[PDB]
Amino acid sequence: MPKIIEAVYENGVFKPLQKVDLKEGERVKIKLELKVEPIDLGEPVSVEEIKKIRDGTWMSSLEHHHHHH
Amino acid sequence: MPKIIEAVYENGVFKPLQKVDLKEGERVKIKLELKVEPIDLGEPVSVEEIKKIRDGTWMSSLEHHHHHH
């Protein structure tokens, strides 16, 4: 694998933690390890089905009379 | 903003190409720049519904119609 190894920069030189398979003058890239995570954003609370929603229940009396003559 | 440092590992030491003024035993991770390995071709094509999965021959009983009097 393309392995990472840790090293301790002593006095101006990087001294490994465990040996490296490299030769003299081998070129590599190194960085000071970081911490913390980035920022996170979440979708705000919405109206859920469990919330009180009114229904449209109509009611008529169904009139069925007739004026006579 | 962290940079990536480059160093040359000579005789078991990592010697940067850009001098750093940090502590003795400062913590860093090393990366060895790697080449990518390509892929080959996967599996052949499958059989779909419109591809006709098997034979499509069935017996027609032909026309017998109706007879009356």
Side-chain angles (χ1 to χ4, degrees):
Chain A
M1 300 180 181
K3 296 183 291 179
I4 292 71
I5 309 182
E6 287 76 77
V8 285
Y9 193 67
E10 303 180 348
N11 225 31
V13 296
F14 295 98
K15 297 288 203 60
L17 291 84
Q18 93 176 331
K19 300 176 182 176
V20 194
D21 295 283
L22 295 178
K23 278 67 62 59
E24 318 81 82
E26 255 307 87
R27 282 184 64 151
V28 293
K29 291 180 193 168
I30 323 179
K31 79 281 283 299
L32 306 170
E33 278 302 278
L34 292 166
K35 273 78 177 184
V36 91
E37 288 73 61
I39 309 82
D40 173 45
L41 190 154
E43 49 288 284
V45 43
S46 299
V47 182
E48 194 52 74
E49 59 179 274
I50 190 177
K51 183 149 291 175
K52 197 289 184 306
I53 169 164
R54 191 191 66 102
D55 271 272
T57 38
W58 41 58
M59 185 179 183
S60 43
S61 309
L62 291 78
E63 221 308 276
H64 287 118
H65 283 91
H66 184 85
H67 175 89
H68 298 107
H69 180 248
Chain B
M1 293 62 178
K3 307 176 188 178
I4 59 276
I5 318 297
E6 288 187 85
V8 288
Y9 188 75
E10 312 178 316
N11 218 153
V13 197
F14 288 101
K15 303 279 192 61
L17 300 177
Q18 45 195 31
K19 200 281 179 185
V20 199
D21 180 55
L22 289 176
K23 313 176 200 64
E24 311 106 283
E26 195 75 272
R27 255 50 54 83
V28 294
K29 284 183 190 154
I30 330 170
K31 265 78 168 308
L32 295 71
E33 302 298 86
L34 66 150
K35 298 284 74 185
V36 57
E37 43 182 81
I39 50 179
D40 203 274
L41 189 62
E43 315 92 274
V45 197
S46 42
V47 59
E48 283 62 58
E49 178 184 74
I50 314 179
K51 183 70 177 184
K52 285 74 179 299
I53 309 175
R54 62 177 187 170
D55 181 79
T57 328
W58 201 71
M59 175 174 292
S60 181
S61 195
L62 304 175
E63 274 292 273
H64 44 83
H65 270 257
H66 299 111
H67 51 245
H68 293 148
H69 281 120

